[PDB]
């Protein structure tokens, strides 16, 4: 019967955490993608001269 | 006026053989490659070669009523069509033979036949087929001894078939008698095995007859009329005309045109 006692102890731990708005996380992800989009060989094809597989 | 119109029939039939056969050859190689597909590929290649290198020449000779090339070309044409007809039939015997262990010896089928054995048997049967046609044709050892073929052999414009008795009998035997009885025995046993397997299944708790009957009947009906006269007209004293000879030869040629349609019906095809 102690399983219920342990389960309610774990759920209270996740209750007290810090959260931020969805807008901030979305902006961070979009900024990271925009910053790193330059060096993405699968996204923007590289010239065949510098292609190890061709 | 039907003479000119009949030329379209030959062109329509001939074009189908070349177009129809290359459809299955390209698909098998570019996609299907198993132990039992090499024989089908060899048969398809033989049919394609026969059609392309035989049918137009015969059609042109029939329509123009005058052979245009020399004696060497006519000898080459006879050699090639005999070789192709001999090799096309003998592959069906191999197909029947190897389909037999699968049904009759499921366990030893994998060990009995492999790629090397299949290649060796294909090469052997091709050599056996080739030895029948080119060697007697080039050696001029089949020439007749009567006074009717002298004009044909002395005129470069003319062309016909007046082969001696012995070579005709031997070729007809070694090209039709051996495969037919073997394939009949093979397909008889397969039917019995299915029946027991059907009887056993029924005890525990006619598609095969239809398919075996169709397979047998199509080529036997197409080929037996041509190979039944090759003994008779030589044995008899001019009891068989030449127009019926040509017509039955063309009927026999037709068989391999739709033989690949009868075969090669697997879902993966």
């Amino acid at each position: 019967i102690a399983q219920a006692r342990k389960l309610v102890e774990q759920l209270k731990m996740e209750a007290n955490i810090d959260r931020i708005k969805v807008s901030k996380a979305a902006a961070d992800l979009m900024a990271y993608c925009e910053a790193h989009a330059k060096e993405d060989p699968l996204l923007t094809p590289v010239p065949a001269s510098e292609n190890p597989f061709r | 006026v039907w003479v000119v119109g009949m030329g379209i029939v030959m062109s329509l039939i001939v074009l189908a053989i070349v177009f129809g056969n290359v459809l299955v050859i390209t698909a098998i190689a570019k996609f299907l490659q198993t132990v039992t597909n090499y024989f089908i590929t060899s048969l398809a290649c033989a049919d394609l070669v026969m059609g392309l290198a035989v049918v137009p020449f015969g059609a042109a000779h029939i329509l123009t009523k005058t052979w245009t090339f020399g004696n060497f070309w006519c000898e080459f044409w006879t050699s090639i069509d005999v070789l192709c007809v001999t090799a096309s039939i003998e592959t069906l015997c191999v197909i029947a033979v190897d389909r037999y262990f699968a049904i009759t010896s499921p366990f030893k089928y994998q060990s009995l036949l492999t790629k090397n054995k299949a290649r060796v048997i294909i090469l052997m049967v091709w050599i056996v087929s080739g030895l029948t046609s080119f060697l007697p044709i080039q050696m001029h050892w089949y020439r007749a001894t009567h006074q009717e073929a002298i004009n044909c052999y002395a005129e470069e414009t003319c062309c016909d078939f007046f082969t001696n008795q012995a070579y005709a009998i031997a070729s007809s035997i070694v090209s039709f008698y051996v495969p037919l009885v073997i394939m009949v025995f093979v397909y008889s046993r397969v039917f019995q095995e299915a029946k027991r397997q059907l009887q056993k299944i029924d005890k525990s708790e006619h598609k095969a007859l239809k398919t075996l009957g169709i397979i047998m009947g199509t080529f036997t009906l197409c080929w037996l009329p041509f190979f039944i006269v090759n003994i008779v007209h030589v044995i008899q004293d001019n009891l068989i005309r030449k127009e019926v000879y040509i017509l039955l030869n063309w009927i026999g040629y037709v068989n391999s045109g739709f033989n690949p349609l009868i075969y090669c019906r697997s879902p993966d095809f």
């Binding site: - | 389909r99 699968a102 049904i103 499921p106 366990f107 994998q110 060990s111 397969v190 095995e193 299915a194 397997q197 059907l198 056993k200 299944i201 525990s204 708790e205 598609k207 095969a208 398919t211 075996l212 019906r265 697997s266």
Partner: protein, 326 residues
């Protein structure tokens, strides 16, 4: 370096040469997977294939099962046992032996259906090496040859799984061997309040038969434990009618092939259980599915030809399915 690639190219040749030899061996083997419920007898069948045909903890293991069997019946007879690693002393073996003669214990053995008890309780207290239950978690395998042919028999086993998510791995086996207990129609399995053991095995068979991945695998059915079935029917303890009401209206099939000497009552009960398993397979069996029922006894029927003959028919029918014959 030009010489750098030459060694690497030669390295591929050595590796690629070994794979050619292994392909022939792999393609010339048959894999059979065992399945069933608990206490069915999957492990016992494997032992028959090892000691017979192709191919010192027994003293302690046999005593381990014997000790637990007597305690369970004696503990519930009224209606130290769990001390860790207690060895069998000379007095310990003598002390446990005397409890069998008690008449009060005998009455508890007569009502063994009500509670849970191991089958081998009577044999060990009063083929011997294989009449013992020892459980193993890791997949149990076995390699043997019958006639110049390689057979690979394995049992995934494990503790009960209600999800069986690993079943998609066995999508290429030759056949599935199914073992059921046909003398356990009045016992409750591992819960003490549930459907009887036979119904629990029937539900498992229905799920296995109607499976997404196993749409082209035949099943061999081993209606095991035929020895106890004749004993239960002979006695008047329990009747099939009480647990299975459909037995009242059942009749003996016309196509009946009993043994040399067998009572009509025993033969009817044998075929009722077999026929009930067959209606499930035929309901959704439309080609490429077959069931082969046998009346096998795991311990006292030594013949591997039953698996050998059925496997040949499976492949023979599989070839007949190709080329559009049957």
């Amino acid at each position: 370096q030009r010489n750098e690639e030459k060694a690497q190219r030669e390295a591929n040749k050595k590796i690629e040469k070994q794979l050619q030899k292994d392909k022939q061996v792999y393609r010339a083997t048959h894999r059979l997977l065992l399945l069933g419920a608990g206490e069915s007898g999957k492990s016992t069948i494997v032992k028959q294939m090892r000691i017979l045909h192709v191919n010192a903890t027994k003293v302690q293991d046999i005593k381990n099962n014997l000790k637990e069997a007597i305690e369970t019946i004696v503990a519930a007879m009224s209606n130290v046992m769990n001390v860790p690693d207690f060895d069998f002393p000379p007095e310990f073996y003598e002390h446990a032996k005397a409890l069998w003669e008690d008449e009060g214990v005998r009455a508890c053995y007569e009502r063994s259906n009500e509670y849970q008890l191991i089958d081998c309780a009577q044999y060990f207290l009063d083929q011997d090496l294989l009449r013992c239950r020892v459980l193993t978690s890791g997949i149990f395998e076995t390699k043997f040859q019958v006639d110049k042919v390689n057979f690979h028999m394995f049992d995934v086993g494990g503790q009960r799984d209600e999800r069986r998510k690993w079943i998609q791995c066995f999508n290429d086996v030759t056949a599935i061997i199914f073992v059921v207990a046909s003398s356990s129609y009045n016992m409750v399995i591992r819960e003490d309040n549930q459907t009887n053991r036979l119904q629990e095995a029937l539900n498992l068979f229905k799920s296995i038969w109607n499976n997404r991945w196993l749409r082209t695998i035949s099943v061999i059915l081993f209606l095991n434990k035929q020895d106890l079935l004749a004993e239960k029917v002979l006695a008047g303890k329990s009747k099939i009618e009480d647990y299975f009401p459909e037995f009242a209206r059942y009749t003996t099939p016309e196509d009946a092939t009993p043994e040399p000497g067998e009572d009509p009552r025993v033969t009817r009960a044998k075929y009722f259980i077999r026929d009930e398993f067959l209606r499930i397979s035929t309901a959704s069996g439309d080609g490429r599915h077959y069931c082969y029922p046998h009346f096998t006894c795991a311990v006292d029927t030594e013949n591997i030809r039953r698996v050998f003959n059925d496997c040949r028919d499976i492949i023979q029918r599989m070839h007949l399915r190709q080329y559009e014959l049957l």
